[PDB]
Design a protein around this ligand. Structure first.
Ligand SMILES: CC(=O)SCCNC(=O)CCNC(=O)[C@H](O)C(C)(C)COP(=O)(O)OP(=O)(O)OC[C@H]1O[C@@H](n2cnc3c(N)ncnc32)[C@H](O)[C@@H]1OP(=O)(O)O
Ligand SMILES: [Cl-]
Length: 159
């Protein structure tokens, strides 16, 4: 998987808004969104966030991520991490997380990256563990059916 990256563009949003395959996946990567996902919901997140970036391979947009918190000299918090279903398990998220780590360091002078994953998202928890993130805290949250879930907050030093 040779991959490139660039800022997200308007024409990318239809494709990216197709990445979550079901209500669970949408909850995991964007818990304030409501199913079905739409370009309007994606565009609204982009407008409130920073660093919205796509990963591209062989002319296809395969991954998306951004920051929902940014604090210069301090940390960024990575969210909306989503990969095309036909392209999972090929390193897209690993590549994109590295690009976002570099952007945090270079543009934000961040010392730390924060992420939070819902307990049911095994793939996400294992992704960030593989990339050297460690768990710090667990917070109670609710899913769209009002059921109690656990949000696992993790972080990683950027040096
Ligand atoms: C902070 C957040 O935004 S959390 C939200 C994460 N997003 C979602 O859950 C939305 C739906 N899911 C997806 O988009 C994807 O499955 C992602 C983002 C979780 C993973 O993206 P991928 O590009 O498939 O992951 P990538 O291939 O880069 O794998 C990197 C690591 O993730 C983990 N991983 C990825 N998929 C799986 C899986 N199906 N089962 C177990 N571990 C997995 C492994 O640790 C893997 O490392 P390895 O292959 O060296 O063992
Ligand atoms: Cl998010």
């Amino acid at each position: 998987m040779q991959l490139s990256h660039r800022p997200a563009e308007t024409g990318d949003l239809e494709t990216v808004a197709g990445f979550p395959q079901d209500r669970d996946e949408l909850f995991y990567c964007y818990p304030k969104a409501i199913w079905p996902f739409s370009v309007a919901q994606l565009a609204a997140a982009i407008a409130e966030r920073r660093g919205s970036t796509v990963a591209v391979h062989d002319g296809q947009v395969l991954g998306f991520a951004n920051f929902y918190q940014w604090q210069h000299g301090d940390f960024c918090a990575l969210g909306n991490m989503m990969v095309a279903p036909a392209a999972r398990g090929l390193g897209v998220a690993r590549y994109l997380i590295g690009v976002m780590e570099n952007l945090a360091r270079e543009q934000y002078k961040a010392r730390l990256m924060k992420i939070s994953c819902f307990n049911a998202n095994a793939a996400g928890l294992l992704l960030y563990t593989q990339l050297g993130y460690q768990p710090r805290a667990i917070a109670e949250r609710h899913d769209p059916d009002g059921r109690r879930v656990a949000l696992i907050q993790m972080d990683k030093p950027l040096e």
